[PDB]
Write a protein that binds this ligand. Structure first.
Ligand code: HEM
Length: 148
């Protein structure tokens, strides 16, 4: 695993300011799949527009949480067996919140977007494919929360 090094290396750029970078991730997500917006219901209110989410302390705390789970998957990039149980649970919580499993493919595209934009010239097709591999394994794990 040298592609493990490619993940470890790229992530370090992004980990320096996780809320900045997570903000790009979720802005892109809403641009591709606007129907995700109502699933963030804090105090029983719905955001009207994507920009409304960026003022919400609870939504910004969710971005921090997301970046923490990714950082965990990176730390255990060599063996993802050790997060499997936690990820099944995380999946079930999201099934319960109303997230469809198909929407996690959008998430993966939004992560690769955010990496591409952050790393520019450094984001080689080798690293695109490493991250695709990792994320596909990560979603495989989460997928059990929808049974399977
Ligand atoms: C695809 C769209 C997503 C939506 C709509 C969504 C929505 C939510 C909502 C509504 C909650 C409960 C409220 C909260 O704690 O803020 C939640 C919790 C959480 N989400 Fe997400 N989420 C998504 C993706 C992700 C992803 C990709 C990750 C991680 C990589 C993640 C990590 C978390 C964590 C760690 C929690 C707290 C779970 C717990 O321990 O109870 N979420 N999400």
């Amino acid at each position: 695993r040298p592609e493990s090094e490619l993940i470890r290396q790229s992530w370090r750029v992004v980990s320096r300011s996780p809320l900045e970078h997570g903000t790009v991730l979720f802005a892109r997500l809403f641009a591709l799949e606007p129907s995700l917006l109502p699933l963030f219901q804090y105090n029983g209110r719905q955001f009207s527009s994507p920009e409304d989410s960026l003022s919400s302390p609870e939504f910004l705390d969710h971005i921090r949480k997301v970046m923490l789970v990714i950082d965990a998957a990176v730390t255990n990039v060599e063996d993802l067996s050790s997060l499997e149980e936690y990820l099944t649970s995380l999946g079930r919580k999201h099934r319960a919140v109303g997230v469809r499993l198909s929407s996690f493919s959008t998430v993966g595209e939004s992560l690769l977007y955010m990496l591409e934009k952050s790393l520019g010239p450094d984001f080689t097709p080798a690293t695109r494919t490493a991250w695709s591999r990792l994320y596909g394994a990560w979603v495989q794990a989460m997928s059990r929360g929808w049974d399977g």
